[PDB]
């Protein structure tokens, strides 16, 4: 029952600040259109320190640790009438690339849906003994807003030995362009 | 000291081995191998097992720097490897398990 900061992405609201990691975080993902697709974990959030990017690019799951020249507004662009992702505007530069992962090939639902938020993805991140503990949960719901009361065990998926400086982070959203725009989603901070 | 909390920190529970050998005729030169540097400077300290190669100018006491400002300098300090010095200023090369 602790305080959960809700960052809503609604029509003009495109919320992805630099959020402190301080000791670990609970990422919730109230989703229907897979808008939130990534994170950037670092400390300086620029090309000076090491940082890791953990994204789903609708074909793969990519984990990459470099000195990323962070775009201050990183976003994926999906054409709202076409239903296809157009842009990969993540970073301009990457160097001293420390870790590199790409997952298996797949094809994800890129399109904007309507109605209620169909699936909830619950993620828990920890920097322990220089690992990056990444834990996962998933169950379907259908609601308009307001992260529901419930109980679900989260599972370890990735024990990531990155060995990097993570004190801050930023979510990577999806901007839906029909020139930028959104559709409805929300994510949650969870210290 | 400076190695752990600024350059790279090690946890105090599980560590492998220190593979260290003498590279006096490899890295050093009797005038000074001034081609290598190390961090003395960060807004804070590191967690265990953590890299940091941030060339943002910082402060030695963790103070948030908007440079040019108070105690704002470059993160990296010299080594100075001689072949005409004792073991404390000679280079070794260390592999950690
Ligand atoms: C956190 O939640 C409690 C009860 O749910 C509430 O009293 C408190 O105001 C919340 N914190 C903030 C910052 O609103």
UniProtKB/Swiss-Prot annotation, chain B:
Changing residue 78 to G: In strain: Isolate GD03. Changing residue 85 to S: In strain: Isolate GD03 and Isolate SZ3; 20fold decrease of affinity with human ACE2; decrease of affinity with palm civet ACE2. Residues 22-92 are annotated as: Receptor-binding motif. Changing residue 65 to A: Complete loss of human ACE2 binding in vitro. Disulfide bonds join 65-72. Attaches the virion to the cell membrane by interacting with host receptor, initiating the infection. Binding to human ACE2 and CLEC4M/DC-SIGNR receptors and internalization of the virus into the endosomes of the host cell induces conformational changes in the S glycoprotein. Proteolysis by cathepsin CTSL may unmask the fusion peptide of S2 and activate membrane fusion within endosomes. This is Spike protein S1. The gene is S. The chain holds residues 403 to 499 of 1255 of the full protein.
């Amino acid at each position: 029952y602790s305080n959960v900061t809700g960052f809503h992405t609604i029509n003009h609201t495109f919320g992805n600040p630099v959020i402190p990691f301080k000791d670990g975080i609970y990422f919730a993902a109230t989703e229907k259109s897979n808008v939130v697709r990534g994170w950037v974990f670092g400390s300086t959030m620029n090309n000076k320190s090491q940082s890791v990017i953990i994204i789903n690019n609708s074909t793969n799951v990519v984990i990459r640790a470099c000195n990323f020249e962070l775009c201050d507004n990183p976003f994926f662009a999906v054409s709202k009438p076409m239903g296809t992702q157009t842009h990969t505007m993540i970073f301009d530069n990457a160097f001293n690339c420390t870790f590199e992962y790409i997952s298996d090939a797949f094809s994800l639902d890129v399109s904007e849906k309507s109605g209620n938020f169909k699936h909830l993805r619950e993620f828990v991140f920890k920097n322990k003994d220089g690992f990056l503990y990444v834990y996962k949960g998933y169950q379907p719901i259908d609601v308009v807003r307001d992260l529901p009361s419930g109980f679900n065990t989260l599972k370890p998926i990735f024990k990531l030995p990155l060995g990097i400086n993570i004190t801050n982070f930023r979510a990577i959203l999806t901007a839906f362009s029909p020139i930028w725009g959104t559709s409805a989603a929300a994510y949650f901070v969870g210290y | 000291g400076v190695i752990a909390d600024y350059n790279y920190k090690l946890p105090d529970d599980f560590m492998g081995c220190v593979l260290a050998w003498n590279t006096r005729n490899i890295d050093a030169t009797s005038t000074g191998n001034y081609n290598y540097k190390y961090r003395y400077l960060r807004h804070g300290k590191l967690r265990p097992f953590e890299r940091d190669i941030s060339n943002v100018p910082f402060s030695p006491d963790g103070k948030p720097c908007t440079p040019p400002a108070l105690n704002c300098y470059w993160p990296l300090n010299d080594y100075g490897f001689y072949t005409t010095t004792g073991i404390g200023y000679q280079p070794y090369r260390v592999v950690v398990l």
